[PDB]
Amino acid sequence: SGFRKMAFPSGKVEGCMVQVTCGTTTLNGLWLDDTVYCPRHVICTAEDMLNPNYEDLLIRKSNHSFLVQAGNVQLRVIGHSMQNCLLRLKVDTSNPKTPKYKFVRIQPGQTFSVLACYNGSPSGVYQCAMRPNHTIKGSFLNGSCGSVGFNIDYDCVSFCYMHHMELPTGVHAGTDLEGKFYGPFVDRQTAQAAGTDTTITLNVLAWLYAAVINGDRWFLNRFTTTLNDFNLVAMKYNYEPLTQDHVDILGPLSAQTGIAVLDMCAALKELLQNGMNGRTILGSTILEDEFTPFDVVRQCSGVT
Amino acid sequence: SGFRKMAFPSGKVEGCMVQVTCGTTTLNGLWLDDTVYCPRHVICTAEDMLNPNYEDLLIRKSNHSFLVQAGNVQLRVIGHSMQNCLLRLKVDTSNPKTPKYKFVRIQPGQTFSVLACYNGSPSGVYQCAMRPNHTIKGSFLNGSCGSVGFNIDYDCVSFCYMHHMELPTGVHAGTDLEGKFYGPFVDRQTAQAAGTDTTITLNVLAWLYAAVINGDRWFLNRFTTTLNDFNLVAMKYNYEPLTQDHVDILGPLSAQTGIAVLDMCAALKELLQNGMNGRTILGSTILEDEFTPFDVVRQCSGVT
Ligand SMILES: *[C@H](O)[C@H](C[C@@H]1CCNC1=O)NC(=O)[C@H](CC(C)C)NC(=O)OCc1ccccc1
Ligand SMILES: *[C@H](O)[C@H](C[C@@H]1CCNC1=O)NC(=O)[C@H](CC(C)C)NC(=O)OCc1ccccc1
Numbered sequence: 304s305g306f307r308k309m310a311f312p313s314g315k316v317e318g319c320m321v322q323v324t325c326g327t328t329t330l331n332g333l334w335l336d337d338t339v340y341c342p343r344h345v346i347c348t349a350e351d352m353l354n355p356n357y358e359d360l361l362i363r364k365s366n367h368s369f370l371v372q373a374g375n376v377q378l379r380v381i382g383h384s385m386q387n388c389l390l391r392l393k394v395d396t397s398n399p400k401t402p403k404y405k406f407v408r409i410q411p412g413q414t415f416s417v418l419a420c421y422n423g424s425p426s427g428v429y430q431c432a433m434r435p436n437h438t439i440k441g442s443f444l445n446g447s448c449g450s451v452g453f454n455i456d457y458d459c460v461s462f463c464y465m466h467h468m469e470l471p472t473g474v475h476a477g478t479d480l481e482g483k484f485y486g487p488f489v490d491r492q493t494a495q496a497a498g499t500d501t502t503i504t505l506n507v508l509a510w511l512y513a514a515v516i517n518g519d520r521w522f523l524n525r526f527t528t529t530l531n532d533f534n535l536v537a538m539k540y541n542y543e544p545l546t547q548d549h550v551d552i553l554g555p556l557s558a559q560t561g562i563a564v565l566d567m568c569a570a571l572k573e574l575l576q577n578g579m580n581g582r583t584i585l586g587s588t589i590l591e592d593e594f595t596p597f598d599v600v601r602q603c604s605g606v607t
Numbered sequence: 608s609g610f611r612k613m614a615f616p617s618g619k620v621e622g623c624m625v626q627v628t629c630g631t632t633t634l635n636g637l638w639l640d641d642t643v644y645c646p647r648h649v650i651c652t653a654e655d656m657l658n659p660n661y662e663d664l665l666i667r668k669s670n671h672s673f674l675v676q677a678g679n680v681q682l683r684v685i686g687h688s689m690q691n692c693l694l695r696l697k698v699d700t701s702n703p704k705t706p707k708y709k710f711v712r713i714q715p716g717q718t719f720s721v722l723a724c725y726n727g728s729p730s731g732v733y734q735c736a737m738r739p740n741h742t743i744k745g746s747f748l749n750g751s752c753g754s755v756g757f758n759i760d761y762d763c764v765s766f767c768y769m770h771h772m773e774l775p776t777g778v779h780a781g782t783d784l785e786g787k788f789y790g791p792f793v794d795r796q797t798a799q800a801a802g803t804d805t806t807i808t809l810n811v812l813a814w815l816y817a818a819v820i821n822g823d824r825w826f827l828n829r830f831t832t833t834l835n836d837f838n839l840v841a842m843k844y845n846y847e848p849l850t851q852d853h854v855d856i857l858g859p860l861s862a863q864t865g866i867a868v869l870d871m872c873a874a875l876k877e878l879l880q881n882g883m884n885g886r887t888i889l890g891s892t893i894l895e896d897e898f899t900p901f902d903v904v905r906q907c908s909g910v911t
């Protein structure tokens with residue numbers, strides 16, 4: 304009858320984390336097979352970071368300009384190249400811990416676990432979601448760049464995020480494992496702002512189905528709505544528009560609970576218009592939007 | 608400027624988890640050196656679980672009555688004994704993954720990470736606290752017994768909890784790694800109830816200091832209180848009494864923020880009496896009590 308925000312076990316990623324130093328600037332990298340991935344601003348100074356020109360900054364570096372440390376062990380760089388906003392460093396040694404893995408570009412609303420690291424040393428793990436405005440509400444200090452986000456499916460680690468920067472609002476920006484930013488951000492410490500955020504409607508709905516599956520029905524009602532009438536109230540309350548694709552996604556959960564999706568939208572509309580007036584859903588006083596339909600399914604298997 | 612509930616990286620514990628089967632009953636065990644720890648109700652049936660007599664149930668078992676599986680590998684049991692509510696199983700093999708570790712009995716209000724496991728296979732990690740009534744607000748399904756809670760300090764894993772049961776309220780009960788229950792519970796599926804819970808005052812205060820350190824001062828005020836006058840309002844709002852020891856604990860945070868502890872109690876009193884009336888602290892609309900003073904310190908290093 305309980306429901307946590309749960310992270311993937313982090314052991315397979317812990318074995319891949321390393322320290323990368325260039326000058327006085329240190330951050331984390333990801334050691335897979337004979338390659339180490341890390342943010343490219345490791346080659347910047349304090350001065351360079353306002354408006355770095357990475358073309359010209361990297362041509363001035365050699366293999367021995369990078370110092371890579373896996374715990375006590377020191378890795379020798381034999382090669383180096385830039386891929387968008389990442390550096391790819393080739394090392395003499397192939398990481399014997401390398402898990403089976405994929406590089407994936409995740410979509411807004413999707414969730415993943417973050418392994419926060421400092422000086423190449425894991426310090427914590429937590430779950431988060433790609434906001435619609437392409438930031439994540441993370442917990443990152445200096446030293447944290449190169450920390451990665453990932454999902455684990457079966458034996459296979461799907462890396463989806465590497466950490467690069469914090470925006471003035473306290474949220475965080477980064478790239479996929481090909482070094483392409485999520486969002487319209489760049490890895491220079493100029494005046495950048497997150498655009499307006501929105502609540503992830505599909506995820507709130509999924510969470511309401513979770514509440515029903517764990518036995519709570521108090522917010523349901525006898526009304527239904529059309530997609531267009533629901534989206535009218537969605538804009539009012541800054542919720543993402545609901546699409547027919549989202550309705551199809553919620554099919555299995557709708558099948559498991561016997562509550563039609565647009566009936567659950569009716570319920571949500573009622574919750575957005577009348578508040579929760581002192582009551583909780585799955586222990587929360589607010590409408591939660593960082594559980595995907597897919598998270599709800601793993602979390603609570605049967606138990607319906 | 609952000610603040611997550613963060614779990615310890617789980618790799619050192621993942622390497623210790625195994626499957627233990629006796630009859631048709633399967634659960635997780637903890638493999639450290641040449642010993643496997645697991646809940647003793649693995650020897651019960653569906654029938655035995657109402658009122659097991661474990662003395663007599665265990666005398667009827669041999670070494671080969673237990674089947675222990677570490678992944679593909681099968682471990683041979685050479686020995687077995689009972690320690691309160693745990694079974695200790697001796698195996699031919701010493702776990703080559705065994706981390707440095709301690710067995711600790713944690714105190715109410717203290718936090719730890721849980722590695723939820725099914726069939727010996729880790730599935731998720733999350734942070735939680737020992738409630739004052741000796742339960743934890745976990746997320747556990749069938750198959751989850753033997754899942755463990757732990758803190759990691761330096762290189763050393765301090766195991767503090769092994770999971771045994773769910774109470775009618777949806778909260779969870781278990782033992783330390785010596786098999787002594789936290790709380791007045793027993794490992795029989797009789798009519799057991801959690802006693803009344805209380806909010807962990809020390810942790811809320813710690814969290815308010817966190818909010819100040821991450822730059823939020825809106826809830827502060829010009830008033831102070833005595834310990835006794837604060838505890839008068841604490842009973843009204845079902846908060847644990849504040850003691851002089853708790854005040855001493857909050858010293859470093861008080862020193863770092865310049866806000867005297869009883870001034871922060873004044874602030875908290877004001878928050879309990881006037882609500883938050885639409886405002887958040889560290890992103891929450893409610894007063895959070897599962898971060899210890901010690902968690903606040905690691906989370907946010909300097910940044911004051
Ligand atoms: C990488 O270590 C660092 C992570 C930042 C640091 C504090 N919290 C984070 O997420 N990234 C940067 O420092 C980044 C480097 C540019 C070349 C992209 N610049 C940045 O994030 O400026 C924002 C900032 C805010 C508060 C303290 C320090 C930096
Ligand atoms: C161990 O696998 C199991 C964990 C329970 C199962 C569902 N959620 C949990 O935390 N422990 C038991 O099944 C326990 C065994 C006794 C001999 C202690 N009995 C129990 O927890 O009964 C409560 C229950 C509630 C809902 C479904 C099943 C059991």
Ligand SMILES: [Ca+2]
Pocket residue numbers: 387388
């Ligand atoms: Ca680019």
Ligand SMILES: [Ca+2]
Pocket residue numbers: 437484485486487
């Ligand atoms: Ca984009």
Ligand SMILES: [Ca+2]
Pocket residue numbers: 529530531532
């Ligand atoms: Ca319509």
Ligand SMILES: [Ca+2]
Pocket residue numbers: 691692
């Ligand atoms: Ca006993």
Ligand SMILES: [Ca+2]
Pocket residue numbers: 741788789790791
């Ligand atoms: Ca006790």
Ligand SMILES: [Ca+2]
Pocket residue numbers: 833834835836
């Ligand atoms: Ca007093």
